[PDB]
PDB file of C-alpha atoms (C1' of nucleotides) and ligand atoms in Angstrom:
ATOM      1  CA  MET A   1     177.900 106.901 -24.710  1.00 24.07           C
ATOM      2  CA  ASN A   2     180.415 109.412 -23.269  1.00 22.24           C
ATOM      3  CA  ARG A   3     180.024 112.199 -25.634  1.00 23.28           C
ATOM      4  CA  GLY A   4     182.786 114.251 -23.929  1.00 27.24           C
ATOM      5  CA  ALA A   5     185.188 111.277 -24.125  1.00 24.72           C
ATOM      6  CA  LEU A   6     184.358 111.036 -27.980  1.00 25.50           C
ATOM      7  CA  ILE A   7     185.134 114.468 -28.474  1.00 28.37           C
ATOM      8  CA  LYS A   8     188.543 113.988 -26.817  1.00 28.62           C
ATOM      9  CA  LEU A   9     189.316 111.217 -28.815  1.00 29.61           C
ATOM     10  CA  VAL A  10     188.728 113.008 -32.125  1.00 28.38           C
ATOM     11  CA  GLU A  11     191.119 115.877 -30.790  1.00 27.75           C
ATOM     12  CA  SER A  12     193.853 113.700 -29.509  1.00 28.12           C
ATOM     13  CA  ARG A  13     195.262 113.449 -33.088  1.00 29.85           C
ATOM     14  CA  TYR A  14     196.287 117.230 -33.032  1.00 34.63           C
ATOM     15  CA  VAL A  15     197.145 117.938 -29.436  1.00 32.34           C
ATOM     16  CA  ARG A  16     200.370 119.078 -28.869  1.00 33.42           C
ATOM     17  CA  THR A  17     202.763 118.687 -25.800  1.00 34.05           C
ATOM     18  CA  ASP A  18     206.052 120.288 -26.857  1.00 29.98           C
ATOM     19  CA  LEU A  19     205.205 123.909 -25.815  1.00 28.05           C
ATOM     20  CA  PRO A  20     206.422 125.352 -22.705  1.00 27.14           C
ATOM     21  CA  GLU A  21     204.014 126.294 -19.797  1.00 30.82           C
ATOM     22  CA  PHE A  22     203.451 129.924 -19.129  1.00 30.60           C
ATOM     23  CA  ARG A  23     200.938 132.516 -17.303  1.00 28.39           C
ATOM     24  CA  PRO A  24     199.327 135.737 -18.081  1.00 29.16           C
ATOM     25  CA  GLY A  25     202.009 138.394 -17.095  1.00 24.31           C
ATOM     26  CA  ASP A  26     204.817 136.531 -18.683  1.00 25.57           C
ATOM     27  CA  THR A  27     206.941 138.008 -21.657  1.00 27.00           C
ATOM     28  CA  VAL A  28     206.701 135.314 -24.456  1.00 24.59           C
ATOM     29  CA  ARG A  29     208.295 135.273 -28.018  1.00 26.37           C
ATOM     30  CA  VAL A  30     206.085 133.038 -30.435  1.00 27.71           C
ATOM     31  CA  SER A  31     207.618 131.990 -33.625  1.00 28.48           C
ATOM     32  CA  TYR A  32     204.832 131.588 -36.134  1.00 31.02           C
ATOM     33  CA  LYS A  33     204.909 130.203 -39.796  1.00 31.95           C
ATOM     34  CA  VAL A  34     203.701 132.594 -42.233  1.00 33.61           C
ATOM     35  CA  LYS A  35     202.762 132.459 -46.032  1.00 34.79           C
ATOM     36  CA  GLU A  36     203.778 135.260 -48.468  1.00 35.17           C
ATOM     37  CA  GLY A  37     202.957 134.491 -51.908  1.00 35.64           C
ATOM     38  CA  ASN A  38     204.220 131.130 -52.626  1.00 33.46           C
ATOM     39  CA  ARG A  39     206.833 130.972 -49.918  1.00 37.43           C
ATOM     40  CA  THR A  40     206.795 130.083 -46.261  1.00 33.84           C
ATOM     41  CA  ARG A  41     209.041 131.743 -43.429  1.00 34.51           C
ATOM     42  CA  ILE A  42     208.986 132.321 -39.633  1.00 36.65           C
ATOM     43  CA  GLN A  43     207.986 135.426 -38.090  1.00 37.73           C
ATOM     44  CA  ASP A  44     208.662 136.179 -34.282  1.00 37.42           C
ATOM     45  CA  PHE A  45     206.105 137.942 -32.342  1.00 35.18           C
ATOM     46  CA  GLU A  46     207.109 138.926 -28.654  1.00 31.89           C
ATOM     47  CA  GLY A  47     205.005 140.530 -26.077  1.00 34.20           C
ATOM     48  CA  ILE A  48     203.239 140.216 -22.858  1.00 33.46           C
ATOM     49  CA  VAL A  49     200.600 137.359 -22.442  1.00 37.53           C
ATOM     50  CA  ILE A  50     197.411 139.136 -21.218  1.00 37.82           C
ATOM     51  CA  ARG A  51     194.766 136.216 -21.506  1.00 40.06           C
ATOM     52  CA  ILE A  52     194.727 132.396 -21.623  1.00 39.81           C
ATOM     53  CA  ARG A  53     191.139 130.977 -22.090  1.00 41.70           C
ATOM     54  CA  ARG A  54     191.085 127.308 -21.474  1.00 39.20           C
ATOM     55  CA  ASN A  55     188.795 124.818 -23.541  1.00 41.68           C
ATOM     56  CA  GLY A  56     191.165 121.662 -23.440  1.00 41.43           C
ATOM     57  CA  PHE A  57     192.212 121.370 -27.216  1.00 43.07           C
ATOM     58  CA  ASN A  58     190.590 124.459 -28.134  1.00 43.11           C
ATOM     59  CA  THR A  59     192.706 126.670 -25.732  1.00 41.42           C
ATOM     60  CA  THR A  60     193.768 130.146 -27.102  1.00 43.93           C
ATOM     61  CA  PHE A  61     196.060 133.022 -25.614  1.00 43.76           C
ATOM     62  CA  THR A  62     196.421 136.699 -26.487  1.00 43.87           C
ATOM     63  CA  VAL A  63     199.962 138.426 -26.849  1.00 43.85           C
ATOM     64  CA  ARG A  64     200.181 142.116 -26.585  1.00 44.11           C
ATOM     65  CA  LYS A  65     203.121 144.430 -28.025  1.00 42.66           C
ATOM     66  CA  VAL A  66     203.692 147.966 -28.994  1.00 40.35           C
ATOM     67  CA  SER A  67     205.137 148.193 -32.442  1.00 41.92           C
ATOM     68  CA  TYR A  68     206.174 151.567 -33.997  1.00 43.62           C
ATOM     69  CA  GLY A  69     204.001 153.360 -31.802  1.00 37.62           C
ATOM     70  CA  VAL A  70     200.710 151.415 -32.214  1.00 37.20           C
ATOM     71  CA  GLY A  71     199.776 148.604 -29.903  1.00 35.57           C
ATOM     72  CA  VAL A  72     199.169 145.260 -31.500  1.00 36.02           C
ATOM     73  CA  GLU A  73     197.258 142.260 -29.945  1.00 37.12           C
ATOM     74  CA  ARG A  74     197.528 138.694 -31.438  1.00 36.66           C
ATOM     75  CA  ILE A  75     195.616 135.616 -30.407  1.00 36.52           C
ATOM     76  CA  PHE A  76     197.022 132.325 -31.038  1.00 39.32           C
ATOM     77  CA  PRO A  77     195.571 128.611 -30.853  1.00 39.07           C
ATOM     78  CA  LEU A  78     197.628 126.914 -28.210  1.00 38.99           C
ATOM     79  CA  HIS A  79     197.806 123.656 -30.305  1.00 38.41           C
ATOM     80  CA  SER A  80     198.060 125.151 -33.642  1.00 40.56           C
ATOM     81  CA  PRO A  81     200.633 123.429 -36.057  1.00 40.96           C
ATOM     82  CA  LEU A  82     201.621 126.853 -37.413  1.00 42.46           C
ATOM     83  CA  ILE A  83     203.629 127.632 -34.011  1.00 44.28           C
ATOM     84  CA  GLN A  84     207.279 126.674 -34.593  1.00 43.41           C
ATOM     85  CA  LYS A  85     208.109 127.123 -30.918  1.00 41.32           C
ATOM     86  CA  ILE A  86     207.492 129.552 -28.052  1.00 41.66           C
ATOM     87  CA  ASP A  87     210.361 131.069 -26.028  1.00 43.04           C
ATOM     88  CA  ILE A  88     209.979 132.433 -22.635  1.00 44.87           C
ATOM     89  CA  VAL A  89     211.712 135.863 -22.426  1.00 42.90           C
ATOM     90  CA  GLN A  90     210.606 136.872 -19.024  1.00 38.79           C
ATOM     91  CA  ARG A  91     208.481 135.559 -15.895  1.00 40.58           C
ATOM     92  CA  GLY A  92     206.038 138.155 -14.635  1.00 39.16           C
ATOM     93  CA  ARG A  93     203.927 138.100 -11.543  1.00 36.47           C
ATOM     94  CA  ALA A  94     200.433 139.286 -11.867  1.00 33.57           C
ATOM     95  CA  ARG A  95     197.615 139.142  -9.417  1.00 33.23           C
ATOM     96  CA  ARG A  96     194.563 138.299 -11.700  1.00 32.48           C
ATOM     97  CA  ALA A  97     194.020 135.943 -14.716  1.00 34.51           C
ATOM     98  CA  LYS A  98     192.986 138.746 -17.098  1.00 36.70           C
ATOM     99  CA  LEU A  99     195.353 141.784 -17.633  1.00 38.37           C
ATOM    100  CA  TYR A 100     193.299 143.943 -19.910  1.00 36.28           C
ATOM    101  CA  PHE A 101     194.031 146.988 -17.594  1.00 36.38           C
ATOM    102  CA  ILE A 102     197.473 147.300 -19.050  1.00 39.20           C
ATOM    103  CA  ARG A 103     195.974 148.609 -22.232  1.00 42.81           C
ATOM    104  CA  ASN A 104     195.635 152.010 -20.636  1.00 42.57           C
ATOM    105  CA  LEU A 105     198.919 152.234 -18.873  1.00 46.54           C
ATOM    106  CA  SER A 106     202.330 153.561 -20.083  1.00 43.21           C
ATOM    107  CA  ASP A 107     205.630 151.667 -20.257  1.00 45.63           C
ATOM    108  CA  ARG A 108     206.662 152.766 -16.869  1.00 43.56           C
ATOM    109  CA  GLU A 109     203.463 151.768 -15.105  1.00 42.68           C
ATOM    110  CA  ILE A 110     203.442 148.372 -16.935  1.00 42.39           C
ATOM    111  CA  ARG A 111     206.880 147.599 -15.641  1.00 44.54           C
ATOM    112  CA  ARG A 112     205.998 148.603 -12.113  1.00 42.86           C
ATOM    113  CA  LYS A 113     202.898 146.398 -12.026  1.00 44.82           C
ATOM    114  CA  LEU A 114     204.314 143.279 -13.841  1.00 45.42           C
ATOM    115  CA  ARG A 115     207.622 142.772 -11.697  1.00 45.31           C
ATOM    116  CA  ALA A 116     209.716 139.836 -12.132  1.00 43.59           C
ATOM    117  CA  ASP A 117     208.377 136.667 -10.487  1.00 46.32           C
ATOM    118  CA  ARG A 118     211.457 135.470  -8.646  1.00 48.19           C
ATOM    119  CA  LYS A 119     209.978 131.937  -7.574  1.00 49.27           C
ATOM    120  CA  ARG A 120     209.426 130.738 -11.086  1.00 51.18           C
ATOM    121  CA  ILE A 121     212.542 132.166 -12.534  1.00 49.76           C
ATOM    122  CA  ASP A 122     214.480 130.184 -10.186  1.00 46.20           C
ATOM    123  CA  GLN A 123     212.520 127.016 -11.282  1.00 44.31           C
ATOM    124  CA  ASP A 124     213.275 127.492 -14.824  1.00 46.27           C
ATOM    125  CA  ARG A 125     216.995 128.079 -13.508  1.00 45.37           C
ATOM    126  CA  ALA A 126     216.895 124.691 -11.471  1.00 46.33           C
ATOM    127  CA  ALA A 127     215.421 123.142 -14.610  1.00 42.24           C
ATOM    128  CA  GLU A 128     217.736 122.988 -17.667  1.00 41.28           C
ATOM    129  CA  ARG A 129     220.766 122.593 -15.040  1.00 39.75           C
ATOM    130  CA  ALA A 130     220.225 118.795 -15.573  1.00 42.43           C
ATOM    131  CA  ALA A 131     223.040 118.583 -18.025  1.00 40.40           C
TER     132      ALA A 131
ATOM    133  C1'   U B   1     176.500 264.111 -63.934  1.00 40.50           C
ATOM    134  C1'   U B   2     172.263 260.331 -59.790  1.00 43.05           C
ATOM    135  C1'   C B   3     172.144 256.092 -63.687  1.00 41.94           C
ATOM    136  C1'   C B   4     173.638 253.105 -68.890  1.00 43.16           C
ATOM    137  C1'   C B   5     178.366 252.594 -72.079  1.00 46.62           C
ATOM    138  C1'   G B   6     183.733 253.882 -73.096  1.00 49.02           C
ATOM    139  C1'   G B   7     188.065 256.417 -71.777  1.00 50.29           C
ATOM    140  C1'   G B   8     192.213 259.318 -68.710  1.00 49.17           C
ATOM    141  C1'   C B   9     195.373 260.359 -64.236  1.00 52.95           C
ATOM    142  C1'   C B  10     196.681 259.283 -59.080  1.00 54.42           C
ATOM    143  C1'   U B  11     195.557 255.972 -55.146  1.00 57.16           C
ATOM    144  C1'   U B  12     194.098 250.989 -52.950  1.00 57.20           C
ATOM    145  C1'   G B  13     193.508 245.181 -52.635  1.00 58.71           C
ATOM    146  C1'   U B  14     194.761 240.870 -55.403  1.00 58.86           C
ATOM    147  C1'   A B  15     195.276 233.503 -54.625  1.00 56.42           C
ATOM    148  C1'   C B  16     195.165 237.450 -61.856  1.00 57.49           C
ATOM    149  C1'   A B  17     200.396 237.668 -65.778  1.00 58.31           C
ATOM    150  C1'   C B  18     198.111 235.842 -73.582  1.00 59.66           C
ATOM    151  C1'   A B  19     196.273 239.173 -67.325  1.00 61.28           C
ATOM    152  C1'   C B  20     188.091 238.499 -64.899  1.00 65.43           C
ATOM    153  C1'   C B  21     186.054 235.840 -71.615  1.00 67.34           C
ATOM    154  C1'   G B  22     191.366 235.617 -65.093  1.00 68.76           C
ATOM    155  C1'   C B  23     191.499 232.367 -61.273  1.00 69.09           C
ATOM    156  C1'   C B  24     188.874 228.703 -58.460  1.00 69.72           C
ATOM    157  C1'   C B  25     185.792 225.031 -54.372  1.00 65.71           C
ATOM    158  C1'   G B  26     183.010 220.431 -53.345  1.00 66.28           C
ATOM    159  C1'   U B  27     179.033 216.688 -53.977  1.00 66.47           C
ATOM    160  C1'   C B  28     177.764 213.531 -57.989  1.00 67.62           C
ATOM    161  C1'   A B  29     179.207 210.010 -62.949  1.00 66.18           C
ATOM    162  C1'   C B  30     183.233 206.955 -65.071  1.00 70.27           C
ATOM    163  C1'   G B  31     188.273 205.090 -64.940  1.00 68.88           C
ATOM    164  C1'   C B  32     193.159 204.165 -62.615  1.00 67.61           C
ATOM    165  C1'   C B  33     196.363 203.465 -58.284  1.00 67.96           C
ATOM    166  C1'   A B  34     197.452 202.581 -53.411  1.00 67.52           C
ATOM    167  C1'   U B  35     194.939 202.155 -48.361  1.00 68.69           C
ATOM    168  C1'   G B  36     191.707 201.973 -43.450  1.00 69.21           C
ATOM    169  C1'   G B  37     187.321 198.941 -41.271  1.00 68.86           C
ATOM    170  C1'   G B  38     185.253 194.074 -41.604  1.00 68.98           C
ATOM    171  C1'   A B  39     181.362 188.122 -40.051  1.00 66.27           C
ATOM    172  C1'   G B  40     185.637 185.274 -40.934  1.00 65.97           C
ATOM    173  C1'   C B  41     189.516 182.324 -43.239  1.00 63.77           C
ATOM    174  C1'   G B  42     194.810 180.484 -43.586  1.00 62.19           C
ATOM    175  C1'   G B  43     199.625 180.730 -41.561  1.00 61.62           C
ATOM    176  C1'   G B  44     204.362 182.068 -38.413  1.00 58.40           C
ATOM    177  C1'   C B  45     206.809 183.006 -33.942  1.00 57.71           C
ATOM    178  C1'   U B  46     206.085 182.696 -28.765  1.00 59.49           C
ATOM    179  C1'   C B  47     204.522 182.013 -23.450  1.00 59.84           C
ATOM    180  C1'   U B  48     202.320 178.866 -19.534  1.00 61.30           C
ATOM    181  C1'   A B  49     200.354 174.140 -17.383  1.00 62.40           C
ATOM    182  C1'   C B  50     200.218 169.081 -17.553  1.00 64.98           C
ATOM    183  C1'   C B  51     201.273 164.071 -19.976  1.00 64.46           C
ATOM    184  C1'   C B  52     204.420 160.367 -22.661  1.00 65.83           C
ATOM    185  C1'   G B  53     209.539 160.207 -22.834  1.00 68.82           C
ATOM    186  C1'   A B  54     215.246 157.832 -26.361  1.00 70.10           C
ATOM    187  C1'   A B  55     220.654 158.406 -25.412  1.00 68.97           C
ATOM    188  C1'   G B  56     223.593 159.639 -21.502  1.00 67.32           C
ATOM    189  C1'   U B  57     225.888 161.637 -16.833  1.00 65.32           C
ATOM    190  C1'   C B  58     224.837 161.358 -12.037  1.00 65.74           C
ATOM    191  C1'   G B  59     222.562 159.430  -7.164  1.00 64.54           C
ATOM    192  C1'   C B  60     220.440 154.447  -4.751  1.00 65.16           C
ATOM    193  C1'   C B  61     220.356 149.039  -5.146  1.00 66.11           C
ATOM    194  C1'   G B  62     222.967 144.857  -6.828  1.00 69.46           C
ATOM    195  C1'   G B  63     218.794 140.630  -3.690  1.00 69.20           C
ATOM    196  C1'   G B  64     215.101 135.217  -3.414  1.00 67.91           C
ATOM    197  C1'   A B  65     219.858 136.032  -8.662  1.00 65.72           C
ATOM    198  C1'   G B  66     224.652 136.134 -13.114  1.00 65.19           C
ATOM    199  C1'   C B  67     230.355 136.918 -14.151  1.00 63.17           C
ATOM    200  C1'   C B  68     235.486 138.474 -12.215  1.00 62.23           C
ATOM    201  C1'   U B  69     238.590 139.116  -7.956  1.00 63.77           C
ATOM    202  C1'   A B  70     243.683 141.890  -6.090  1.00 65.46           C
ATOM    203  C1'   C B  71     236.616 140.623  -2.499  1.00 65.59           C
ATOM    204  C1'   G B  72     234.761 145.836   3.892  1.00 66.21           C
ATOM    205  C1'   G B  73     235.852 145.243  -4.032  1.00 64.37           C
ATOM    206  C1'   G B  74     234.383 145.393  -9.165  1.00 63.17           C
ATOM    207  C1'   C B  75     231.228 144.608 -14.108  1.00 59.37           C
ATOM    208  C1'   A B  76     226.566 143.468 -16.004  1.00 62.55           C
ATOM    209  C1'   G B  77     221.848 144.316 -14.488  1.00 60.80           C
ATOM    210  C1'   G B  78     217.496 146.907 -11.810  1.00 62.19           C
ATOM    211  C1'   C B  79     215.317 151.687  -9.617  1.00 62.55           C
ATOM    212  C1'   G B  80     215.214 157.314  -9.552  1.00 63.77           C
TER     213        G B  80
HETATM  214 MG1   MG C   1     187.176 129.402 -20.730  1.00 63.32          MG
HETATM  215 MG1   MG C   2     192.423 128.866 -16.043  1.00 64.45          MG
HETATM  216 MG1   MG C   3     184.532 128.106 -23.590  1.00 66.42          MG
HETATM  217 MG1   MG C   4     191.409 138.199 -26.738  1.00 69.05          MG
HETATM  218 MG1   MG C   5     190.234 134.985 -27.120  1.00 69.36          MG
HETATM  219 MG1   MG C   6     193.974 134.377 -18.099  1.00 68.25          MG
HETATM  220 MG1   MG C   7     192.470 131.821 -14.889  1.00 72.41          MG
HETATM  221 MG1   MG C   8     191.002 138.443 -13.964  1.00 72.65          MG
HETATM  222 MG1   MG C   9     191.856 144.182 -16.149  1.00 72.81          MG
HETATM  223 MG1   MG C  10     195.707 264.353 -68.696  1.00 74.98          MG
HETATM  224 MG1   MG C  11     192.728 250.585 -60.259  1.00 75.08          MG
HETATM  225 MG1   MG C  12     200.848 244.014 -57.511  1.00 74.98          MG
HETATM  226 MG1   MG C  13     194.450 228.514 -66.968  1.00 75.21          MG
HETATM  227 MG1   MG C  14     185.290 224.858 -62.095  1.00 76.99          MG
HETATM  228 MG1   MG C  15     182.177 217.865 -48.791  1.00 75.76          MG
HETATM  229 MG1   MG C  16     179.256 208.941 -66.679  1.00 77.29          MG
HETATM  230 MG1   MG C  17     184.885 205.969 -60.014  1.00 78.33          MG
HETATM  231 MG1   MG C  18     191.876 194.983 -44.902  1.00 78.87          MG
HETATM  232 MG1   MG C  19     189.639 196.010 -48.056  1.00 76.14          MG
HETATM  233 MG1   MG C  20     210.754 161.837 -16.696  1.00 80.43          MG
HETATM  234 MG1   MG C  21     208.560 163.742 -16.831  1.00 79.92          MG
END
RNA sequence: UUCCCGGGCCUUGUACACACCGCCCGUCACGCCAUGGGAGCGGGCUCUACCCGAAGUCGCCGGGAGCCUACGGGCAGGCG
């Protein structure tokens, strides 16, 4: 018996592979299906990825944004079917895996610490040029 | 003729004038009106210091990087 292998077999039915790769510090726009009454639509949530905790299929990530003066954080299951798509708005360069410190920074101070990551931006540009 | 009462004439003081059975002061009691002080309570204006900070002009960059060119250039964009 390989208990770890049996678990992966169960989850393989629900594993997604159509989402783009990103890192904490990147600016990301998540398009999420919402239910309001008896209707379904798509709501976009755009912000800075501050945390990705990995458990294989059970991976989740957290996105932070300031909306109408109030900070908001949303935690998403990475393989959730409720995610329509994820867009890469901006590539950021961080020096650590968890970015809880930006909760106590102003907008100018956040822009200083999370500067654009040139190397990964060029890789996104080199990709998608295969037209 | 000292004293009690009443009167006469002159003079003197007066805050009295239906005129001393005149006038008049202050506390206290009650009522009305406005007001000072007062643990505090609720507001308005204003000053100083620091924090965040839109638009926009201005200054610097414009690259490890987009667009235009008449390019020792410009626009977008970034920083202050
Ligand atoms: Mg973990
Ligand atoms: Mg990890
Ligand atoms: Mg775990
Ligand atoms: Mg979280
Ligand atoms: Mg979490
Ligand atoms: Mg992380
Ligand atoms: Mg990590
Ligand atoms: Mg960390
Ligand atoms: Mg931290
Ligand atoms: Mg006579
Ligand atoms: Mg006399
Ligand atoms: Mg007289
Ligand atoms: Mg009288
Ligand atoms: Mg009297
Ligand atoms: Mg007295
Ligand atoms: Mg009485
Ligand atoms: Mg009284
Ligand atoms: Mg008073
Ligand atoms: Mg009083
Ligand atoms: Mg300022
Ligand atoms: Mg300032």
